[PDB]
Amino acid sequence: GHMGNAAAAKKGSEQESVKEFLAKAKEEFLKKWESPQNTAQLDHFDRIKTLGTGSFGRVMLVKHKETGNHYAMKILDKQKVVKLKQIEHTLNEKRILQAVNFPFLVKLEFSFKDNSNLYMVMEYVPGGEMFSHLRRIGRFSEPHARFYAAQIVLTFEYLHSLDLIYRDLKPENLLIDQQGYIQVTDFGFAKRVKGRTWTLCGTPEYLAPEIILSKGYNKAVDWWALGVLIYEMAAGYPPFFADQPIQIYEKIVSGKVRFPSHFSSDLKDLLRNLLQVDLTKRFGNLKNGVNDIKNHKWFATTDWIAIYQRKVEAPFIPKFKGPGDTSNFDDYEEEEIRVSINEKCGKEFTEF
């Protein structure tokens, strides 16, 4: 076969160790998931700079006044979180983040709320978004893309074992830490799903066909999105690429992907099996689960345990000028945070 006797036995033992790890991880997750609040307040922090913006608020670099430690504070305007799924998703995000623990997931430190806003205070990751670095350099070489992809594979193996779907993979949500490893942020679309779920949500370029077609769907949408991410990292642009969302959706559902001439055949083979419309054939969704991905030829040089233990030398280390340095983030319009004298949407956010 492809493996000799010694290589096959080592792989088998490796997969039994994964099972052992995930069983312990599920025990630790459930303890925090069953008993999640109000671990700080706004005036405990100095607000420094906006690091990113969305339709519901912003993420700001903040400095804890007492300790001087820096954090990233996500501020959500409760009155902007108006639509039904916008509300449920915000509760998903907080509850999941307080319960998970993995080396490539951003760590939540505090959460609280006031009359106007919801707040989630996270570890500050000063290396910036993968997105910026990718757009600046153009594309990543296949070994460089593979290093990041392996971290996402392990992170999804972890999340999916807890019945969590992530649902918003893209370079904008992948921060680079001081050692060059990934930290996944923005769990606004993450959800605990034991089988199928039905919300039409995500980012157009990264949506699996079954989402676009209003089909009930499962964790395999994350493996489709991994295919999009790997393609974009290695090409510099995603596989379904058009100016308007409706045009993007048409390309996704077609079942057609073209590859740059510089893609290795191993990479193209992996991507055709991730970007697979037929769910009975999509890698990650078959009887051998995530091992069809981890054992694919394109990952043959990947030491999965060494990636997890962060023993592998990273292809890129961001420059850091010191604590609180924001040089690796883009600039955004600043808007003062106003807290109303009246409580807004108190009942819609009781559990936060």
Partner: peptide, 14 residues
Amino acid sequence: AAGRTGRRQAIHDI
């Protein structure tokens, strides 16, 4: 090869 090159917003519904 015309497509979106800036940051892409996620959509919660529709």
